[PDB]
């Protein structure tokens, strides 16, 4: 099988700046029909691969001309002359000259932007969930950059450990920010045992941590 | 236009079978072989199988030989991947493709766990979910299996400011996710906000109105 080696694995880049991705094959990629089948694909989260380049250097229809492919033999390059925020995603090379068709491991293109502090919101458990028998407290950190953020849960001002889970969106295609959801999960009995529920957020964009909190049974 | 429409994905026990289908429209099937290519969650692309334009030559990835069989019904422009003796490591989104064009993908989950539909709870906008002149609201989709669930807002009419988070696998072995949206706080009380949640594996469809609360 043809081994496809892609480099770099991660490519953070400011819009307007150029990017270059290397793909190296372990064999030549010339098919019996005489063509060289090296392709490049763009993939956004939850979407199939979008073919960008076929046969080394040819753009598929509608692909912007800031994407270009070059190379020969076993050495190939995808260049983005000036990256746009909408280019965020994972890029793959692939060969179609030998069975099995094989792909590179992917290059994650991440967009750099100015620091943006999260907006922080907190949601008590709903009455319906409380009727159900458990309590989920949700803390939302909205539209921030860079991706690193720290969330700490406090119950009656006691730091919590091991009872929360986090999820981060992929980088937004328009404003290049991230958002984060943190859920603290308690039994309903434990939830009713305490009063103050707090989500404390630290992030490069905040000169001091931001805490959002509520009192159970209170306004 | 070219479309490759897939169907047949879902949850299977280890050792079970699934049949994926791919209906091709707008593509000249005499000059494009049809392939199946899969992608495990968080991983890259791995070619699975091919059937030739002549309808006879087929090939398979070593990891699926003897277990998967590709076929076609050219009269209905349809292509099939019969997946037998499935293994947890076969869990992936499967694409039918001719490499120029790619289907939307079909998620096949191989697990010993059972299907479970989600509960859907509102994340009501309140004082503690307000920042300046904007409010956040959402829906919590809790305790389901397997992936995926889809969430839209106002039947898809509301897209600006929506964030639907990747599901987290809880210690219970069940997934939970949230979908949120930020809106002008002056719109609360005149604009109705409804989250449309679908979990097809369990036949769950919920439309939850998320109403503002001065106090919770």
């Amino acid at each position: 099988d043809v081994v496809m080696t892609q480099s770099p694995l991660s490519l953070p880049i400011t819009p307007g700046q150029p990017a270059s991705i290397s793909c190296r094959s372990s064999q030549g990629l010339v098919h019996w029909d005489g063509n060289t089948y090296l392709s490049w694909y763009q993939q956004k989260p939850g979407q199939p691969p979008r073919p960008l380049i076929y046969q080394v250097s040819n753009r598929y229809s509608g692909v912007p001309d800031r994407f270009s492919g070059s190379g020969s033999g076993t050495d190939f390059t995808l260049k983005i002359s000036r990256v746009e925020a909408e280019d965020v995603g994972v890029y793959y090379c692939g060969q179609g000259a030998h069975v099995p068709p094989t792909f590179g491991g992917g290059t994650k293109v991440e967009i750099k932007r100015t620091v943006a502090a999260p907006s922080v919101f907190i949601f008590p458990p709903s009455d319906e969930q409380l009727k159900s028998g458990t309590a989920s407290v949700v803390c939302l950190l909205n539209n921030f950059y860079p991706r690193e953020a720290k969330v700490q849960w406090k119950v009656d001002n006691a730091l919590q450990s091991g009872n929360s889970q986090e999820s981060v969106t992929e980088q937004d295609s328009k404003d290049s920010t991230y958002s984060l959801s943190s859920t603290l999960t308690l039994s309903k009995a434990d939830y009713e045992k305490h009063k103050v529920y707090a989500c404390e957020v630290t992030h490069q964009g905040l000169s001091s941590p931001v805490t959002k909190s509520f009192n159970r049974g209170e306004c | 236009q070219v479309q490759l429409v897939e169907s047949g994905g879902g949850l299977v026990k280890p050792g079970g079978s699934q049949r994926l289908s791919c209906v091709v429209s707008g593509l000249t099937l005499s000059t494009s072989d049809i392939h199946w290519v899969r992608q495990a969650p968080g991983k890259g692309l791995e070619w699975v199988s091919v059937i030739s334009t002549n309808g006879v030559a087929t090939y398979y990835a070593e990891s699926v030989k003897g277990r998967f069989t590709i076929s076609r019904d050219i009269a209905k422009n349809s292509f099939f991947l019969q997946m037998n003796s499935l293994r947890v490591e076969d869990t992936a989104v499967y694409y039918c493709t001719d490499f120029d064009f790619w289907g939307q993908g079909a998620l096949v989950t191989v697990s010993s766990a059972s299907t479970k539909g989600p509960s859907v709870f509102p994340l009501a906008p309140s004082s503690k979910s307000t920042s300046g002149g904007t409010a956040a609201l959402g829906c919590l989709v809790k305790d389901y299996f397997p992936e995926p669930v889809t969430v839209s807002w106002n039947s898809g009419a509301l897209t600006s400011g929506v964030h639907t988070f990747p599901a987290v696998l809880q210690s219970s072995g069940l997934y939970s996710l949230s979908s949120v949206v930020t809106v002008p706080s002056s719109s609360l009380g005149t604009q109705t906000y409804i989250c449309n949640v679908n979990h097809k594996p369990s036949n769950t469809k919920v439309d939850k109105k998320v109403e503002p609360k001065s106090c919770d």
Partner: peptide, 8 residues
């Protein structure tokens, strides 16, 4: 297809 060669 233009992206891949025929199989035999």
């Amino acid at each position: 297809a233009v992206g891949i060669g025929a199989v035999f």
